[PDB]
């Protein structure tokens, strides 16, 4: 994730966020961060997306920087999936950049840091929760803050990312001000009072910066994404016979999947 990024954007770049009903994404292809998003839950969430005309492609994590059952269910449902070489949401970003999908879907705000033009949050949320889709457009963030992607990456590092520490005591609004004035973390460190704001020791901000800018990602052109009809009998057999889920529950969902 990126700590505080969503709230910060709502505060200082509100035009970059839109809250939309799930119904409004009819016909959209969406790349889903499979790890952030168990079999019955995937079954139901995917059906809910398909009922609304959304065509999801699930992207699975590769090796981190430094599931066979789920894939079986997706194949039987007619839902495509991809193995990312590394972080799934970075490959989701690549699929958006390449025009293969409309948006990336994940709760991980660092999908924007990896450069995704569009990020949709809460798509995988259960229908009961009543959460509207939270949709971010990266270009609007950069335009509102007057930053380029490199500067945005350093801001996200200062906010707090998965891959390195942040500067203790530097708040989100303050981090924006520092990035706007100084452009890079290297310059910020020259200008900060070490007596007031000491930086972490052995700080890996350069390494994290390079990871966000040049992540290892799949090639969107290698696999043509396809959505097809489910294998209903095999689906029942696997989910009910092997995985002990309710035959009535599965049949109801399968019926809905075909009807959509
Ligand atoms: K938006
Ligand atoms: K840049
Ligand atoms: K950096
Ligand atoms: K690529
Ligand atoms: Mg991450
Ligand atoms: Mg992840």
């Amino acid at each position: 994730g990126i700590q505080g990024l969503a709230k910060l954007i709502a505060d200082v770049a509100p035009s970059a966020i839109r809250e939309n009903d799930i119904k409004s994404y009819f016909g959209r292809k969406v790349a889903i961060d499979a790890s952030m998003s168990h079999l019955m839950g995937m079954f139901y969430r995917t059906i809910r997306m398909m009922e609304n005309g959304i065509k999801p492609v699930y992207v699975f994590d590769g090796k981190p920087p430094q599931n066979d059952e789920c894939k079986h269910l997706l194949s039987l449902m007619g839902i495509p999936y991809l193995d990312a070489p590394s972080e799934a949401e970075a490959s989701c970003a690549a699929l958006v950049k390449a025009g293969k999908v409309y948006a990336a879907a994940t709760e991980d705000m660092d999908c924007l840091t990896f450069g995704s033009p569009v990020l949709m949050r809460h798509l995988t949320a259960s229908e009961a929760k009543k959460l509207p889709i939270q949709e971010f457009h990266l270009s609007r963030i950069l335009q509102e803050l007057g930053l380029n992607q490199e500067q945005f990456v350093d801001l996200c590092i200062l906010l707090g990312s998965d891959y390195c520490e942040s500067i203790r005591g530097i708040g989100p609004k303050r981090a924006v001000d520092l990035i706007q004035k100084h452009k890079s973390i290297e310059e910020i460190v020259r200008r900060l009072d070490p007596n007031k704001y000491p930086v972490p020791e052995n700080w890996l901000h350069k390494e994290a910066h390079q990871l966000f800018l040049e992540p290892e990602v799949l090639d969107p052109e290698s696999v043509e994404l396809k959505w097809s009809e489910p294998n209903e009998e095999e689906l029942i057999k696997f989910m009910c016979g092997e995985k002990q889920f309710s035959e009535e529950r599965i049949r109801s969902g399968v019926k809905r999947l075909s009807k959509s």
Side-chain angles (χ1 to χ4, degrees), residues 1-37 39-66 69-129 131-232 234-260:
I2 303 293
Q3 300 185 44
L5 178 54
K7 168 182 163 49
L8 173 66
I9 297 167
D11 290 346
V12 306
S15 66
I17 316 180
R18 292 295 175 243
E19 285 189 9
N20 287 128
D21 196 296
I22 184 165
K23 302 283 173 305
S24 64
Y25 294 93
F26 178 93
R28 305 297 200 177
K29 299 173 191 182
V30 180
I32 301 186
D33 180 357
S35 51
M36 267 287 165
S37 301
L39 283 180
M40 201 62 185
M42 176 165 286
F43 178 71
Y44 276 133
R45 301 300 118 80
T46 301
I47 289 168
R48 174 168 190 248
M49 290 179 252
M50 289 289 285
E51 276 185 339
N52 289 287
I54 302 173
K55 301 194 307 292
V57 52
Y58 282 87
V59 182
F60 290 98
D61 279 333
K63 47 186 54 191
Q66 58 205 16
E69 287 183 323
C70 293
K71 291 174 179 182
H72 188 46
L73 168 65
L74 291 178
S75 301
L76 300 177
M77 289 182 79
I79 303 298
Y81 60 84
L82 297 167
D83 285 328
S86 191
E87 299 287 39
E89 79 274 25
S91 281
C92 293
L95 287 158
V96 184
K97 291 178 194 153
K100 302 305 192 181
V101 302
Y102 167 79
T106 181
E107 299 311 299
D108 195 330
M109 289 295 295
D110 78 8
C111 188
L112 293 167
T113 318
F114 280 112
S116 184
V118 189
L119 168 64
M120 287 166 63
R121 300 214 304 169
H122 313 144
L123 181 63
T124 56
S126 149
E127 56 162 55
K129 319 200 49 61
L131 293 170
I133 308 311
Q134 188 180 48
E135 184 173 351
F136 297 83
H137 275 79
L138 177 57
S139 60
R140 299 265 200 157
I141 299 168
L142 305 184
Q143 183 68 40
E144 190 58 47
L145 304 175
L147 304 179
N148 63 21
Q149 186 67 23
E150 298 194 344
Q151 294 150 7
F152 181 65
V153 168
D154 269 2
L155 169 64
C156 289
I157 288 168
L158 289 185
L159 293 176
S161 78
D162 295 359
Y163 309 106
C164 66
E165 276 298 331
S166 64
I167 299 177
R168 188 173 167 77
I170 300 302
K173 302 268 193 95
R174 177 81 157 116
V176 169
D177 188 64
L178 291 170
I179 293 290
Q180 287 175 330
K181 290 180 183 163
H182 306 115
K183 319 308 184 166
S184 67
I185 290 181
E186 287 86 341
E187 172 73 3
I188 290 171
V189 168
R190 295 182 208 109
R191 310 276 78 96
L192 283 184
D193 180 8
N195 289 320
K196 207 210 312 196
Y197 295 119
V199 300
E201 194 167 347
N202 301 320
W203 197 10
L204 301 177
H205 69 93
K206 301 186 297 286
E207 290 76 5
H209 182 98
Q210 169 75 358
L211 161 67
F212 282 124
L213 280 183
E214 293 174 39
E216 199 192 352
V217 295
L218 56 82
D219 189 327
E221 189 68 9
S222 279
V223 181
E224 184 178 342
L225 299 180
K226 299 275 187 63
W227 290 259
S228 54
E229 29 184 292
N231 189 341
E232 313 190 345
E234 263 311 298
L235 198 50
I236 303 279
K237 173 173 200 174
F238 169 67
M239 290 290 280
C240 310
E242 184 174 339
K243 299 310 292 191
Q244 294 295 289
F245 294 121
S246 165
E247 180 160 347
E248 170 262 317
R249 291 181 182 127
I250 296 298
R251 284 229 167 87
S252 164
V254 169
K255 175 43 134 211
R256 286 162 63 195
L257 188 59
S258 72
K259 277 304 298 163
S260 78

